[PDB]
Symmetry: D2
Subunit: 117 residues, 4 copies
């Protein structure tokens, strides 16, 4: 149920393949200048008791056109059904000097759906 | 650089390779083979040249051939090179839960990695 | 209109707060989840002179999960901002830390996000 | 309780607190220099009847970054636990939320961690 195209609440798109070995691979777009590689992992044998499927992935914000010197990790769970969702919290760390490291990391949350909001 | 064997402050072992394409690959051990897990992630392969660190992140899903915790951790942070290289991170650990239990699904913390055991 | 009032989060918890002229938040919190029963004391702070450029009003508060009925040996802090409008809202992210031994400290802190409205969802 | 007194974090900040019998935390948060323009009110809560099994004491507090001299339109909450002894510590994680427009709310909140000791670093 994970493989395919997902859309967050703020206009980003997330195209992922969930491989048989637990791999997540794909592209994240916040135009080619805005598309970035993503990789991660998911539980390939989740429980069948109503619990979600744990997963996570990373995007480093560098491509052939731009580089923000930063990276976001999303940690969350996939929930299947008629209104399937991937519910996540995220951390976005920028490369900083030591003096600025205290303010290097933003935190937030993203909800992804199989239909554009 | 990033490629190498790292240890967090609690003794976990992080064996990583940073590839030319921005890929992180390797294994994470939270001393036995039953405790070794696949990791994948990404890093900035062209960092700034002003003294700033190198941003990165990776994920471990806590399933291997021997155990399955139905959970996954992501680490987000930066590599700081120099005399004692370090990777400073903050992490999120999400378990698969029912909807009624989702409010308590995610733990948060911080790990610092060096090339020497604690 | 303003922060003072009774708010409900997406799970039905009840947040009764007064925003004082000196920047103080005081009131009570009743949790719809966890090892909790009845009302708990909260205190916190808010920006009593927010920017005039359309930005929200920053704030934060703490509940220690001890009252006359129960003690969970834990505390939650909510950090967020109030956003005025036709449907006023307080958007927060929270940290819930339990008292633990050192060996268990790595798993002492849960994290999440709560959104509050003056209308109970 | 062991919490009342002056604490110092890893980056020079100084945390001056009174732990009341009812679970109240009150005091002042300032820089290493301690000039008036760096001092802010703090309020929070702690578990006034912690467990007796060697666990820490859960607590939290908030500072809104407004005083009589400046206003950054933001607030920080620290969530953590106090651990007593000859090397007493308060180990925390924190969230710093700035007031923003809706378009910028995704980048409103920083996260980090502070460790406080009874002696200057
Ligand atoms: C223009 O470069 C980008 O596309 C870009 C750049 C940065 C950055 O830190 O640069 C200052 C951050 C993001 C970003 C997206 C995103 C998301 O969708 N959910 C979670 C966080 C998040 O962060 C995207
Ligand atoms: C036997 O299962 C494990 O080895 C295992 C299981 C879980 C789990 O949450 O299972 C529900 C979590 C970890 C783990 C390690 C680790 C770390 O080193 N830094 C950051 C967090 C973290 O989480 C390891
Ligand atoms: C004179 O103003 C200050 O000294 C000052 C101002 C701000 C501010 O305006 O934030 C927008 C923030 C801090 C501060 C300290 C601190 C800390 O110790 N741990 C966690 C974060 C943190 O933030 C100090």
């Amino acid at each position: 149920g994970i493989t395919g195209t997902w859309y967050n609440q703020l206009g980003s798109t997330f195209i992922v393949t969930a491989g048989a070995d637990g791999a997540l691979t794909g592209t994240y777009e916040s135009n080619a200048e805005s598309r970035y590689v993503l990789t991660g992992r998911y539980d390939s044998a989740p429980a069948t008791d109503g619990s979600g499927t744990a997963l996570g992935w990373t995007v480093a914000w560098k491509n052939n056109y731009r580089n923000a010197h930063s990276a976001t990790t999303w940690s969350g769970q996939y929930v299947g059904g008629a209104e399937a969702r991937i519910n996540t919290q995220w951390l976005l760390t920028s490369g900083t000097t030591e003096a600025n490291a205290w303010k290097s990391t933003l935190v937030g949350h993203d909800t992804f759906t199989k239909v554009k909001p």
